[PDB]
């Protein structure tokens with residue numbers, strides 16, 4: 168049986184994140200723009216887009 | 217005496233149903249569930265912790 | 270992917286391993302912090 | 318809300334496809350042409366089947 | 371009867387893309403009904419300007435009060451059904467000398483993000499004949515004999531705080547256009563933005579192709595319209611209307627869109 | 640079925656039943672069971688908690 | 693599908709559910725229900741209740757930030773920052789210290 172290790176997502180608020188090329192099996196990285204994440208008290212990031 | 221929880225808290229999360237259909241932020245949002253034991257024992261990673269006061 | 274042998278190791282304690290499990294990440298939903306992913310289910314667990 | 322579904326695996330061939338498909342609950346499948354006839358078919362599926370088209 | 375938020379005139383050049391700004395942190399909401407009906411009561415204790423405030427007790431809507439001091443448990447009590455009639459009064463079973471100071475009753479609604487508070491100063495005497503309740507001009511002051519109970523009244527019977535349907539379901543943002551020379555009320559509906567996410571556009575294809583709002587508009591509380599390839603039919607008086615009929619929020623922003631002044635424009639207000 | 644029930648002031652559990660073939664309909668083309676996290680958005684019809692009808 | 697529930701000390705019950713297709717794997721050659729008093733003995737895999745377990749590890753590290761808007765009231769056109777005995781970072785775009793991290797009011 169395999170195990171899908173997914174760590175905590177890197178939310179870069181007011182900036183653009185960059186993927187680092189590692190040597191891991193089925194290593195997958197993707198930067199999604201325009202995220203507006205919500206926590207208990209509203210948006211976690213100060214910037215809107 | 218099994219004091220392996222010196223740096224712990226409950227780690228509240230966002231469950232897709234708190235009851236009543238729609239989703240909520242719950243203390244018991246289960247994050248991982250493994251069932252590879254062939255005798256049907258479900259092993260559930262729950263967001264909170266037990267036992268330690 | 271999705272077939273018997275998607276993950277192969279040489280010995281029960283081999284630290285390196287070969288894997289072809291077809292991980293494809295999708296764009297997360299509006300205002301929710303989570304990592305949605307699409308995955309071919311375990312070839313071993315369904316194979317049985 | 319409604320679920321999405323797991324994108325399936327595809328194997329190819331000369332003038333044909335073979336689609337290996339993975340469900341989790343009873344799900345639907347449909348296929349058609351784009352010509353003067355639709356030549357329509359559809360199918361309920363429940364287990365890890367592969368189909369040829 | 372809608373309150374104005376802010377008024378501006380916007381002049382931009384023909385051939386450019388218009389951005390009609392409409393932003394509000396108080397219109398933020400998401401598709402889910404995640405604890406929308408959540409209010410909180412909390413009583414705070416202070417002792418003048420040169421001491422640090424301490425939260426004493428809090429309580430969620432439809433829930434039970436939480437006390438922070440183990441001695442004060444079963445001693446500081448709110449009515450468990452406080453939220454049904456808006457009777458948020460606090461009954462303290464027995465007062466002592468250490469309880470002297472100003473107590474503030476705070477109501478907060480997390481959906482409208484409203485907070486309302488009033489203060490009452492409690493002073494504990496030893497003689498019962500000095501005990502009185504008076505209004506000093508801006509807050510109630512309660513003089514209480516030692517060991518007697520004190521009912522500090524905090525009553526706010528506004529519809530947002532009482533236990534009633536309390537489900538919105540229909541906040542709507544309207545984008546309106548008042549054409550040059552054309553009077554108001556017979557204005558063409560341009561955009562309807564429903565809290566559920568649905569938008570409704572009206573008019574011929576020449577108008578519908580150019581009017582859009584970002585898909586997370588109400589999620590971020592930013593309803594700015596981006597209109598590509600500005601035509602003369604876009605000039606006019608635009609109005610963004612946020613309507614929360616339940617919370618009594620009815621606000622609009624009005625925009626006089628003129629086409630002139632490419633880089634020389636004075637941004638009004 | 641459908642069974643309603645309550646307990647008396649004089650500690651008597653009243654329970655009234657009725658036949659009612661309850662099958663909530665599908666939405667889209669996937670016979671699912673509960674709301675997942677990831678999923679599309681399709682229009683359905685619900686009730687509300689209001690009384691002023 | 694699966695559900696966990698518990699009731700607070702403020703006596704509020706909470707149920708988080710999850711769509712999961714629990715299906716028992718078959719053992720042997722009889723799709724039985726509950727094991728009888730008279731059985732044949734077949735090996736199988738279960739969980740044991742060992743507390744101090746070796747080599748199954750999770751990474752414990754620091755939390756992210758805790759945003760909240762309820763801790764801000766209007767002190768006659770001002771922003772009062774109640775902290776409730778913690779550390780909070782504020783941010784805006786008006787006059788004064790438009791960003792910064794305070795510790796008390």
Ligand SMILES: *[C@@H]1O[C@H](CO)[C@@H](O)[C@H](O)[C@H]1NC(C)=O
Pocket residue numbers: 448449457459461
């Ligand atoms: C508020 O509740 C208390 C009991 O908790 C009661 O004594 C009091 O009369 C109530 N207030 C009013 C205005 O009835």
